[PDB]
From a paper:
Chalcone synthase (CHS) and chalcone isomerase (CHI) catalyze the first two committed steps of the flavonoid pathway that plays a pivotal role in the growth and reproduction of land plants, including UV protection, pigmentation, symbiotic nitrogen fixation, and pathogen resistance. Through crystal structure, molecular docking, mutagenesis, kinetic analyses, ITC, and FRET analysis, our study provides evidence supporting a revised catalytic reaction mechanism for monocot CHS and CHI and identified an intermolecular interaction of CHS with both CHI and CHIL in a non-competitive manner.
The electron densities corresponding to the residues from 6 to 21 and from 26 to 219 among each of the 223 residues in the native PvCHIL molecule were resolved. The structure of PvCHIL was very similar to that of PvCHI in terms of both the number of secondary structural elements and the overall three-dimensional structure with a backbone RMSD of 1.21 Å. The area of the largest structural differences between PvCHI and PvCHIL was located at the residues corresponding to the ligand-binding pockets of CHI. However, the corresponding primary sequence for those secondary structural features is not conserved, as the active site is replaced in PvCHIL with the following residues: Arg-35 (Thr-37), Thr-47 (Asn-49), Asn-113 (Ser-115), Ser-190 (Trp-193) with Tyr-106 (Tyr-108) as the only conserved active site residue. Close inspection of the results indicated that the PvCHIL utilized its unique protruding loop between β3a and β3b to bind near the homodimer interface of PvCHS. The interaction between PvCHS and PvCHIL was endothermic with ΔH of 31.88 kcal mol−1, ΔS of 127 cal mol−1 deg−1, and Kd of 76.3 µM. As previously observed in snapdragon (Antirrhinum majus) CHS, promiscuity of PvCHS was rectified by PvCHIL, yielding much less CTAL and BNY.
Residue numbers in the entry: 7 to 22, 27 to 219
Write the structure that this text describes.
């Protein structure tokens, strides 16, 4: 177990497999010299040899070298491995506020690669409508499940607030999926650089022995 801002995070989220925690951090912002800690993020990954193969070209590098190498994080996004994003809400916000932030971030990454048409638009609409109904209480846990291959499942976006049961939603438009993946696992472009620095120190270890 590992605590982030007093929020416990499991070392391994099995029963999903064997995804292991590789990065920890928070989503924050500074408005008028004041830190606003929104979320607590934990990135889980399955440590198969497929990962150590797709990341072998970065073996022996340092955390400061992986951090400046935005291609290492793109190769990490493009790994065919079960992934899990565990975002725990810290500050009470409307679920729509996180929805318009997920849309605008993914839409911009979609327009950059020209991969924005109508198939991506509806898959983005199904996500915004999913979050605008729920309200983020300090304890709610959004969960992104990225299976290893497109054969097994698709992409499961789970919600877990205290009281009600786990509200889940499936998306299969892989364009929006691997842009949400870039939103959390990107280099200098990710939403939580604190989570990125944690992956750098972790991967720099495995990718050294």
């Amino acid at each position: 177990t590992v605590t982030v801002e007093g929020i416990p995070f499991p070392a391994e989220i099995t029963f999903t497999p064997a995804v292991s925690l590789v990065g920890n951090g928070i989503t924050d912002i500074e408005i008028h010299f004041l830190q606003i800690k929104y979320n607590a993020i934990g990135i889980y990954l399955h440590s198969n040899d497929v990962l150590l193969d797709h990341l072998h070209g970065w073996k022996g590098k340092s955390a400061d070298e992986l951090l400046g190498d935005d291609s290492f994080f793109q190769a990490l996004v493009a790994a065919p491995v079960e992934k899990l994003f565990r975002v725990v809400v810290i500050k009470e916000i409307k679920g729509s506020q996180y929805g318009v932030q997920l849309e605008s971030s993914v839409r911009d990454r979609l327009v950059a690669a020209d991969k924005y048409d109508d198939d991506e638009e509806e898959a983005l609409e199904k996500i915004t409508d999913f979050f605008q109904a729920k309200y983020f209480k300090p304890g709610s846990v959004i969960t992104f499940h990225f299976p290893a291959t497109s054969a097994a499942g698709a992409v499961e976006i789970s919600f877990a607030t205290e009281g009600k049961d786990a509200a889940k939603m499936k998306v299969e438009n892989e364009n929006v999926a691997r842009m949400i993946q870039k939103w959390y696992l990107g280099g200098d472009s990710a939403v939580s650089p604190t989570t990125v620095r944690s992956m750098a120190d972790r991967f720099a270890a495995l990718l050294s022995a």
